[PDB]
Amino acid sequence: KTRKESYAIYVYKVLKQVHPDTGISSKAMSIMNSFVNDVFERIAGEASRLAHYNKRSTITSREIQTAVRLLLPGELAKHAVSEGTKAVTKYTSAK
Amino acid sequence: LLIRKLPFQRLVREIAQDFKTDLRFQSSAVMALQEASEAYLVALFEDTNLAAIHAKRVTIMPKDIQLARRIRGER
Amino acid sequence: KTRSSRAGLQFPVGRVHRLLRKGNYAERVGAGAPVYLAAVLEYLTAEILELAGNAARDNKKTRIIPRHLQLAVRNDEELNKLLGRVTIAQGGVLPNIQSVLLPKK
Amino acid sequence: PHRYRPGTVALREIRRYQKSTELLIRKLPFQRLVREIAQDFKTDLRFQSSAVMALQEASEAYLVALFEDTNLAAIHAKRVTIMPKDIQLARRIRGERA
Amino acid sequence: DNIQGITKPAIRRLARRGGVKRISGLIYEETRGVLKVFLENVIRDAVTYTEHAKRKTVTAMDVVYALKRQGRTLYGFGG
Amino acid sequence: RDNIQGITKPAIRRLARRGGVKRISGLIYEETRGVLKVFLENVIRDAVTYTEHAKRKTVTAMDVVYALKRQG
DNA sequence: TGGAGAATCCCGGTGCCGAGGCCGCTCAATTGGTCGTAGACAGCTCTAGCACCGCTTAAACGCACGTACGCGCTGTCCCCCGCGTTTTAACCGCCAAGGGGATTACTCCC
DNA sequence: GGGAGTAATCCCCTTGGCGGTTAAAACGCGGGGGACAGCGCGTACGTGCGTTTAAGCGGTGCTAGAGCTGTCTACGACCAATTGAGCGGCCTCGGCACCGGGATTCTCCA
C-alpha cells in the first residue's frame, strides 16, 4: 500500500496533553485533519501573496505573523501571535 | 459623489487613530475608501428595499436592515 | 536533536518545511517560518480540543464525536467567525427556536 | 378520541430533528439524481461512493441554511407559514439570483 | 426525471431541522428547482477538474476543490 | 470625537434615493451609521496591517485595494 | 382548576466492533560543509502630505403643517395539520460481470 | 546511459440485479386557526420656507518619508551520509449504542 501523510498522531499528542482522559473517533480525526490542513493552506497562501506584494522572494517569520494578524479574528489572533513568538524565541536561543 | 469629502476623511482619520498613532494617508486612499463605502450602502439599501416591499410597506424600518444583514451573511 | 523538541512544540517542523517547499509559495523559505506556523496550528488545535472536551463532558461522553466539534465551534464567537463558511459532516444544527413561534397561551 | 392541538407536533418535530444528526434524504434517490444530472454534461462517468456522500452533505447544508433564512423572512412578514415569496427573497438577498 | 424522489416529507424534515412550524404546499417545487440548480453547478465544476486532471472516475477530493471554488468548503471527506 | 454625525440626514436620504427607497423612517439613521462604522472598522484594520508590514507610515491606495479584496 | 394519557427520561443487562497500543522496517529529516547572492543597512533626493488662512455659496437645520399610511381590530373562509388507513420503494445481503488505474517486465531512442 | 512506449496481471472497486420485508410515503378527511381583506384613527413623514453653517476652492509653506542606488555578509539553496520518527499490519477489550420496564413530565379538556 502507498504512504499517506496525516496529522493524527500529533493532534492525539495535543489532546492527551490537554485532556488526559479523553478518546476520539476516526470521523472526528478526519474533520480535525481537514481543519488543520485548510488553515495551513490559508495561512500559507496569505503569506505567499504578502511575499509577492512587496517584491520579495523569501517567506520569513514576519510574513507568517502578518498572515495570522489578517486571517485570524479577535483575541485568538493575539494569543496565537504570543505562542508563535515564544516558540521562535526559544528555538533561536537554544544551544 | 453624495457624502462630503471632508467629513468622510475626518471619520477615516479618527477610526485609524485607534489602531496606529501618527498615521498618514494618501488622497487616493480616502477617495477609494469613500467610493467603496457608498457602493456598500447603496447595495444595502436596495436589499432593505426588497425587505420592506416583502412585508407590504413603503416605509423602511430598522428591522429591515437587521433582516438584510442577517440573510446576507454578516452579523 | 530534532527541531520540534528544540523549538519546544509537539507539531512537526520539518514536515511543515517540506510542505512549504513543495507548494511553491515562494522561491526561498526561511528558518523561523515553519516554527511559527507549527506553533500557530498547535494553538488553534488547543482551543478546538479544549472546547470539544468541554462539550463532551457536558454531554456525558469520553470520546469526541463530530457533533461535539460542531457544538464547540458554533458556540464560541471567534471560532464561529473563523469557521463560518465551513460545514462538518454528521454535525447537525444548533438548537434555536424563534420566540414568536412558542405557544404563548 | 384524544387529539393534540394544531402546532404542538411541529414543536416536537423541530426539537427531535434539531437534536439528531442522521441524514434525511434517502440514499438511492439522491444517487439517481446525481447520476441523471451528470448524464447531461459528459457521458460514461463513474462516481466514488464518498463523492455521493459529500454531495449529500453539501445539499443538506445548503437547504437547511436556506430554510432558516426563509423562516426569518417569513417571521418578518408577520406570518408563521413559509411561502415561495420568502424563498425568492432569501435567494435575492444573497445574490444567487440576478 | 428523478427530481420527484425528493419527496414531500423529506422537505418537511429539512424544514423542521431549520425550525419551520407551518409549510405551504407551493414550497416543494421551488425547493426541487433550487437543489437542481445547485447540484448542476457543483457537478459541472467537479467534471471540469476531473477532465483536466484526466481520470475516468470522479473522486471526492475533486468535488472538495469544486466546493472550495464556490466558497462553500467541506471538512471530513479527505479535504 | 463624535464625528459619526457627519454622515447627515440628507446624505443618507440620497444614498437611499439612489437605491430606490421611497419612504424612510427616523430610526433608520442611527442604524446606518452603525453599519458604516462596522464596515470601516473591518477595512481600516487590514489597511493598517498592510501598511505596517511594509514598514511604511503612509497608507497608500494600493493597500486599500488589497484590503477590499480581502473581504470580496 | 385535576384526572387521562401519551411522550420523554432514565438505569440495568448485552454485545460488538473499533480505538489504541505494540512491533518492525525505511526513507525523508538531520549533520556537516560549501558557495553565491537577497536583502540589511546607509545614504541621497525631492514628491506628496499636513496644515493655516480667507471667501463665496451651496447644503443642511429647524419648524409648521397637511395628510398618507401603520397598525390595531374584526369578519371570513380556506387550506393545512393530526391522525387513521393503504400501498410502495428504499434497503439489505449477496453475487456476478467486468472495467480501471497503478504495478511489474521487455524493449526502444537521443 | 536513462526516460518512456507497450503490454500482462493480481487485483480493487464500480455498477447492475434479484427477492424479502417493512419502514415509510401516499392518500383522505374533519375541522379549525391563520391569511387575507376591509375600516378607523392618529401619528409620523414629505414639502416648503427662512436662516445659519461649513464644505470646497485657491494659495502657500514646511518637511516628513517614499523611492532608489552601492555594497557586502550572513543566510539559505544544495549535496553526501546516516539514522530514528513515523508509517502500516495486527490484537484486543472497553466505550457506547440498543432494548426494555418504569418513573417523570407536559398537555387537554371537562
Each domain of chain B, given as residue ranges in start order, spans: 5-72
Q: CA E33 → C1' H27, Å? A: 25
Q: Residue E3 is inside which H or E element, if any?
A: none
| Number of domains into which chain F is organized | 1
Task: Single out the residue of D91, A14, D45 nearest to residue E48, CA to CA.
Answer: D45
What's the gap in Å between the CA of E19 and the closest CA on chain C? 6
| Domain covering B5-72, topology | Histone, subunit A (1.10.20)
Tell if D48 CB is < 7 Å from nucleic strand H: yes
Closest nucleotide (C1' vs CA) to D25 is: G90
CA E64/CA E45 separation, integer angstroms: 10
Q: Which nucleotides of G are covered by protein (CB under 7 A)?
A: 5-8, 18-20, 28-31, 38-40, 48-50, 59-61, 69-71, 79-84, 89-91, 99-103
- Nearest residue, CB atoms, F58 vs list B25, B43, B61: B25
| CA distance linking residue E11 with residue D90, whole number of Å | 17
Q: What technique solved it?
A: cryo-EM
Residues shown for chain E: 79
Secondary structure (DSSP) of C75-90 = TSHHHHHHTTT-EETT
- Burial of residue B7, with CB atoms counted within 10 A of its CB: 0-12 exposed, 13-18 middle, 19 or more buried: middle
Domain at E46, CATH number: 1.10.20.10
Q: At what angle do helices E60-69 and D49-76 cross, to 10 degrees?
A: 30
The string of DSSP codes covering C12-76 is: -SHHHHHHHHHTTS-SEE-SHHHHHHHHHHHHHHHHHHHHHHHHHHHTT-SEE-HHHHHHHHTTS
> Are the Cβ atoms of E39 and D44 closer than 8 angstroms?
no
Q: Among E36, E37, E41, E43, which would you mutate to test the D interface (most chain D Cβ atoms within 10 Å of its Cβ)?
A: E43
Q: What burial class does residue A68 get, using C-beta atoms within 10 Å of its C-beta: 0-12 exposed, 13-18 middle, 19+ buried?
A: buried
The full set of domain ranges for chain C reads 2-87
Q: What angle do CA F8, B30, F20 make, to 5 degrees?
A: 45
- D and A: touch, per 3+ CB pairs < 8 A? no
| Å between E78 CA and nearest CA of chain A | 7
Give C104's contacts (C-beta < 8 A, 6+ positions apart).
none
Whether E41 and chain C come into contact, CB under 8 Å, resolves to no
CA atoms of E58 and E49, how far apart (whole Å): 9
Q: Return the CATH number of A1-93, one of 2.170.260.10, 3.40.50.300, 1.10.20.10, 1.10.10.60.
A: 1.10.20.10
Tell me, in Å, the resolution of the deposited structure.
Answer: 3.2
Q: Find residue F58's DSSP bridge partners.
A: B24
Which residues from A are below 8 Å from F68, CB to CB? none
Please name the helix (run of DSSP H) or strand (run of DSSP E) that holds residue D97, with its range, or none. Answer: none
CA C55/CA C70 separation, integer angstroms = 10
Select the residue from F49, F51, F53 to test the A interface by mutation, using most A Cβ atoms within 10 A: F53
Q: Look up residue C2 and give its DSSP letter.
A: -
CATH superfamily to which D24-94 belongs: Histone, subunit A (1.10.20.10)
Q: Which residues contact F8 (CB under 8 A, 6 or more apart)?
A: none
Residue B11, amino acid: L
Task: Say whether residue B56 is in contact with chain F using an 8 A CB cutoff.
Answer: no
Cβ-based burial of C102 (10 A; exposed 0-12, middle 13-18, buried ≥19): exposed
Q: Which residues of E touch D7 (CB under 8 A)?
A: 21
State the CB neighbour count (10 A cutoff) for residue D86.
24
CATH T-level assignment (fold) for domain C2-87 = Histone, subunit A (1.10.20)
Q: Which residue has the cell 427531535?
A: D16
Using DSSP bridges, classify how beta strands F23-24 and A58-59 pair: parallel, antiparallel or unpaired: unpaired
Chain E's closest residue to C90, CA to CA, is E76
Tell me which chains share at least 3 CB pairs under 8 Å with chain D.
B, C, E
Smallest Cβ–Cβ distance between D75 and the set C87, C92, C100 belongs to C100
| Residue D3 to chain E, least CA–CA distance (Å) | 18
Domain range holding E43?
Answer: 1-79
